[PDB]
Each structure stands twice: as C-alpha cells, then as structure tokens.
C-alpha cells in the first residue's frame, strides 16, 4: 500500500499514537509524491480541536472548502482513504452504496453509518500507526456532514455536491501550481502537469517533444483545463472507442481523437489541448497519435501515484 506511505509522508499530527491530517496536508498529499521539506509532526493540542470547530463555520462550503480550512482541520486515516477514492475513481457507484445505508429510504444517512460508508467505498510506513480502527475524535468531515453534535443527516445531493466540489478544488488548485501563478497555463506547463506522475520507459520521448516540438501557441485557460480533467475521468468509454480503432487497423488522427472524445464525454476539447496532446504523443511524427501510450499517461495522472 502506497497510500499509507502517502498519508504518513504528509501527516502533521499525532494523537494517541494515531496520526491525523490537516486539509492543508490532504491537499499537498494529493498533488505531490513527496515534498522537499518533510512536515513537522506535533502532538495534537487541545487548541486544534477548538480550531477544528472554528474553521467549519468560517470556511467556504463551495470548491474552496479545503483551502479555506487549511491547518484548521482534522482528517482521520479512514477519511483520507475515503477522500482519495473520490478523486482517483469517482465512479465507484457511491450512489448505490449511499442507498444501501439509506435510512427509511429517504436517500440520506445518519452519522452512525458514516464509518461504514467510508469503509465500503475506500476498501476493495505505520503498521498500527495506520489501520481501520474506530476513532473518538470529531473530525472535520464529520462536523460538516452531520453537524457538530452529530444530529444532522447527509442527503445524497449534498454528498454529490461534495465530491464534485472536491474534484473541482484539486483542478483549480493544480492549475495555479503548474501555471506558476499566472492565470493561463502554458502549453508547456500543461505538459508538466499531465506528465507529473509519468515515470515509465518512454518519458524521454514525451519530454523531448515537450521541449523541442511544443513551445508556441494560445495558452490554456482554467475552464479549458477543467474540461480536460473532466474528460480524464470518463476515459474508459474512451479506452473502448480507442480499441475499436485498433481492431479497425485505423490510425488515430486528430479528427478521430476528436470523435472518441465526444462519444466518451459528450464535450469537445480546446484546440490548444488537442494540439499539445498530439505533439507530445505523436512519436513517429506521422501525425498519428500513440493512443495506447497517451492512455497510459492518463492512467498515471488519474491514479496520482497510489496505483489506483
């Protein structure tokens, strides 16, 4: 398990020999495989709990929920796993799982069936420092979902709005990390993003194409970028439409790639993303994209380096 190595690599608090994450931790661990300066674990004070309650009431409920919280928050190891699953395979039919712990058939769950809900979805360093064992600490998600006292209930609508917003936050946050703060990703910066988790055997051609063959164009905007990200999640219908092009002994040119996208996702990509993806992965230069390899990088980036 690489996820226990990720959690432990970025966790910043110990309580009772049980380790915790702060939303600032959780974000960093999603977009980075290791950080240049490791974090300082500190024993969980009693101010933090006082702060974990403060941040809930002052923090954006939108797609900034984790950036606003920041260091005011708590995420158990079981929660962290749960959150990672939302981001690396957002389609584990959370709806049917939500509907099985459904109470009184109203499509909402009570705090009691929470721990199960994380457990069934997220499942199938630090041996005992990291395990499924139950907690006595009130974490940020629990306070937000079902209220401080725990007496609120969580409707599936609110829980879909929470997964979408969580995805949207990483996309918005990775945009700026890789755009160096400018409001427009460069074609070259989009490539660095796409190939951040790619460490396969052809990274010398990918990267050589980035440097030589792709350095001028119309830059990539946030909504142009998000729309690529929202495509990478639908890739399995893409993978199928790709296979059918191989079994047709058909080279995948641009016009084919544009088609496979509209069938997989119903939307079309910016011209500058299409051009970047082709210039990188058109290895031969025959204007024919190596889809099997482009498809492998997508899986590296979706899996975020946890083997998902």
């Amino acid at each position: 398990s690489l996820r226990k190595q990720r959690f432990m690599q970025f966790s910043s608090l110990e309580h009772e020999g049980e380790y915790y994450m702060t939303p600032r931790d959780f974000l960093f661990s999603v977009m980075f495989e290791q950080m240049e300066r490791k974090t300082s674990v500190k024993k969980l004070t009693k101010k933090d709990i006082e702060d974990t309650l403060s941040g809930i009431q002052t923090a954006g409920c939108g797609s900034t929920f984790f950036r606003d919280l920041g260091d005011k928050g708590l995420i158990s190891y079981t929660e962290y796993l749960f959150l990672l699953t939302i981001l690396t395979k957002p389609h584990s039919g959370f709806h049917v799982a939500f509907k099985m712990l459904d109470t009184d058939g109203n499509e909402m769950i009570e705090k009691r069936e929470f721990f199960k809900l994380q457990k069934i979805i997220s499942k199938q360093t630090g041996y005992q420092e990291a395990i499924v064992k139950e907690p006595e600490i009130n974490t940020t998600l629990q306070m937000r979902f079902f209220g401080k006292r725990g007496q609120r209930k969580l409707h599936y609508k609110e829980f879909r709005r929470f997964m979408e917003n969580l995805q949207t936050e990483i996309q918005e946050m990775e945009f700026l990390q890789f755009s160096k703060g400018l409001s427009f990703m460069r074609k070259e910066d989009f490539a660095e993003w796409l190939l951040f988790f790619t460490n396969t055997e052809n990274k010398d051609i990918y990267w050589k194409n980035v440097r030589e063959k792709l350095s001028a164009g119309e830059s990539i905007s946030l909504d142009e970028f998000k729309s690529f990200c929202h495509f990478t999640t639908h890739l399995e219908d893409f993978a199928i439409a790709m296979q059918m092009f191989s079994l047709a002994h058909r080279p995948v040119r641009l016009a084919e790639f544009k088609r496979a996208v509209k069938v997989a996702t119903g939307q079309e990509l910016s011209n500058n993303i299409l051009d970047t993806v082709f210039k990188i992965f058109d290895l031969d230069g025959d204007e024919c994209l190596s889809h099997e390899e482009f498809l492998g990088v997508l899986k590296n980036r979706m899996h975020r380096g946890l083997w998902v």
Binding site: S92, G93, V96, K99, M100, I120, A241, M244, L247
Partner: protein
C-alpha cells in the same frame, strides 16, 4: 412396457400429496384420495388403503386403480362394448383416457368410441385429434391417439427414453462443436432445412429452434422448393424467407445477441458520419465486423436501410432490434424445455443458468435437495433482465458484503430492484439461492455467482 409404464409417463408419478387439475386431493400416479376440501381427510383417507406415511414401491395404488378402472369400464353400458373388442394395447389407451377423465367423460366420445369398435383406426384418430380433450393436453392425447391408431407402444418408447454414459458422450462431443469449431462447421451441423430454387441452387437453412440449439450448450429433415417456421410476432421474419436463418444471418445474429448495448452505441457513434448514432448500409458493415473481434443478407439490409439500400440505421432502432431478438431467443430457449401450462421445472431453470459454465453439475448436485411449483416465462425473463446489469449488480453485492449485511434473499431482491429496476419473484430466488449459496446458509457466494452469471449473460466464457 405396459399400462403402468404408459400411465407413469402421461401422469407423472408423485410421492407426496397434491391437487390435480380440479380441486380434489390426489397422490401417487393420478390417484384421487377424496373430493373433500380438507387436507386432513386426505391423509387419514390415504392411510385407510395404505397403512401413516405420505410417501415408492407402495404403487399397489396404481394397481388397484387400474383394476377399478377396468371394472368400471366393464359395468358401463357404453364403454364395455368397445373395450371388449380392442386388443391388449388399445385397451391400455382406453384405460388411460378413463384415468385422465373418468368413465363418464370418456364414454362421451360416442363416435370415436363407435369407430374404434368398427376398427376404423385412422378415422377415430383423425376425429379424436379435433377435440377439447386434445386441445387441453395435446401431447398426452397424441400418444394415446397413436396408440389407438396403430395398436403399438411406439408412441411411448419414443418418450420412455429417459444410459447416461452413451448420451453424455454425444452431449460432450456436441458441446465441443459449439465451443471450438468454425461457424461454417457449426451452422452445417445444426441446420435442418434445404431450400431448392433451381434458379441458382440448393442452400441450407436453419429453423429458429435449430438456431437456439446452436448457441445453447447442454440432421436434415425437410426440403423447401410460403411456410411459417416462427411465431406470429417474431424477429425472424425480418430475415425474410419464412422465418428461416441463412448462414450470413447466423453470423450476424450471434454477433448481436452477445454484445452489450453500450458497445453498439459507441461503435455506431464512432463510424457514424456525424457521430450522432445513425449508420448507413456500408458503415454498418465495419461496425458489425469490428464488434465481432471483441455479407448481410438482402432481406435484412433492406429492412434496415430500405430497398434502395441507401437508408440509415438509428442506434435507437437497432437497439430495439437487439432487444427484440434477445427476447424471442429467450422464448425459444425457454420452450426447449418442458413447458407444462407455461411453467418449466425448477430443476431445468437451473439448467439455463449453468448452460455456459460447462462441468458445473457439482453445483446442481446439491440443488435438488430442497426440490413442486413451476416457473413462468415472466419469472425467468425477469431474471434475464436482471443479468443485463450484472456488472452493476456485482458492485452492489460486494458492498452489502463489506458493510456486514448478509447476502440473503431480501438483499438480492432489493439489489435487483435498486440497480436492475425489476422485481425478482420469490420462487426464482429460492432456485437461485439453492444453487449458489453452496453452504446451506441463505447467503450467496457473491463472487462465484457473479462469475457464472457473467457467462450466462453473454453466452461466452469467464
């Protein structure tokens, strides 16, 4: 072969009490205890001529009944003249009819009866076949009427044929034909027809019933020079040619039968001129060929693309082709069994579920433990509508497992409601659970059940 064996095939031999077609209580080989309504009088009546168990060799009951049937025949002024004139065998057929409806009902076939007394065998057989009696139970009646018409047990020797080793050997050989031979070799093996248009020449054809026999695991008889080989509303007439299945159509149907629809949508929208999902005659050919990996006949090609061959096929329209074809093939496969009043045995429905898992008799071995009551076509097709979503259903089953909920009947019935939007009857669950729990607790072997159901669904493998 005798009346006992005859009447053991027409009236099945039941060990435990039941009710015949009318209300009355009955046990044995069609032996009526009493016409009272109380089950308790039946048990106590049953024991008055057995002596206190509701159970095999205690088939003296059939023997005393026949003796009463013979006797009641002989004091009856209309049955007696005929019976005395018939030989050993035709007498058995008449005792058989008396068994089925009693002497008063039999004695009401006064012309047929009068024919059998004047030894007009073909007449009485033509006339008897015309009656409600035959209409209600046409298979029993044809054996009885043959036995009347010919004087011989030949009607029953054919059905008396239940030996497992010689018969399994041909099952095993044939299964390998389906699984490993080329389509040309398969089609030629199971097709039963030949059509001779001298203009051109002789071509082999398949009847629908042949076609389903092709693809379902577990030989020319007729020539055609406007017959109907398929039911009134049957997808096979779109093929043209009376409901027969040519070779090209065999290729095409087996492709579209066992492809999930998402794949056809993606295939349509990929090679479509505008990607909306509407594919022309020529673009259709690469689609169905591509799909084959993972020469359509001139009747179908006009049915989809119009007689000019220039129309176009909607993924919506085709998807209903597939949905319709899958139905009739399920119908045909359902009737390849024993549809007594439109219900097949519990033990046979179990044979549909495992028809594509090969040597899985070991599972069915423990399935006949519990067992009674047939299963309607609608019960079955609902399960097969459930299997359409098996990849979504396997998701749910694993969750209910990890959350600790048990995988008993309510869970399965709930899962079929939630992810498959269909209601699984109670009885088909008992059949499905008896087969796949495998441990005796009412809990499914979810990982195993999902494996075999993935092969039933697509008629494929693993």
């Amino acid at each position: 072969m005798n009346i006992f064996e005859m009447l053991r095939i027409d009236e099945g031999l039941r060990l435990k009490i039941y009710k015949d077609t009318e209300g009355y209580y009955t046990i044995g080989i069609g032996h009526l205890l009493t016409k009272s309504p109380s089950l308790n009088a039946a048990k106590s009546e049953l024991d008055k001529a057995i002596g206190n168990t509701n159970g095999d060799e205690a088939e003296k009951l059939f023997n005393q009944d026949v003796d009463a049937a013979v006797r009641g025949i002989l004091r009856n002024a209309k049955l007696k003249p005929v019976y005395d004139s018939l030989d050993a065998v035709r007498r058995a057929a008449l005792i058989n009819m008396v068994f089925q409806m009693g002497e008063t009902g039999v004695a009401g076939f006064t012309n047929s009866l009068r024919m059998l007394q004047q030894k007009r065998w073909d007449e009485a057989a033509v006339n008897l076949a015309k009656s409600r009696w035959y209409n209600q139970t046409p298979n029993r009646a044809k054996r009885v009427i043959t036995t009347f018409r010919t004087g011989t047990w030949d009607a029953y020797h054919m059905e008396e044929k239940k030996s497992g080793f010689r018969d399994r050997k041909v099952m095993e050989y044939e299964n390998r034909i389906r699984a490993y031979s080329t389509p040309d070799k398969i089609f030629r093996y199971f097709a039963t027809l030949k059509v001779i248009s001298e203009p051109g020449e002789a071509e082999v054809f398949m009847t629908p019933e042949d076609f389903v026999r092709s693809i379902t695991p577990n030989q020319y008889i007729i020539k055609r020079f406007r017959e109907k080989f398929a039911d009134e509303g049957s997808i096979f007439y779109t093929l043209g040619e009376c409901g027969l299945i040519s070779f090209s159509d065999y290729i095409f149907l087996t492709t579209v039968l066992s492809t999930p629809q998402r794949n056809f949508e993606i295939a349509f929208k990929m090679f479509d001129l505008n990607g909306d999902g509407e594919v022309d005659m020529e673009e259709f050919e690469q689609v169905q060929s591509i799909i084959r990996s993972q020469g359509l006949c001139s009747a179908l090609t006009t049915y989809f693309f119009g007689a000019d061959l220039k129309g176009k096929l909607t993924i919506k329209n085709f998807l209903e082709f597939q949905r319709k074809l899958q139905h009739d093939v399920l119908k045909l496969e359902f009737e390849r069994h024993d549809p007594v009043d439109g219900r097949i045995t519990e033990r046979q429905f179990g044979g549909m579920l495992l028809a594509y898992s090969g040597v899985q008799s070991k599972k069915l071995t423990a399935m006949q433990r519990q067992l009674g009551k047939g299963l309607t076509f609608q019960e079955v097709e609902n399960f097969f509508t459930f299997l359409k979503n098996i990849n979504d259903v396997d998701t749910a089953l694993s969750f209910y497992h990890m959350a600790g909920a048990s995988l008993d009947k309510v869970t399965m019935q709930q899962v079929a409601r939630t992810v498959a939007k269909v209601e699984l009857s109670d009885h088909v669950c008992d059949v499905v659970f008896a087969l796949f729990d495998c441990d005796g607790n009412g809990e499914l072997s979810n990982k195993e059940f999902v494996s075999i159901m993935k092969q039933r669904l697509m008629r494929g493998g693993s």
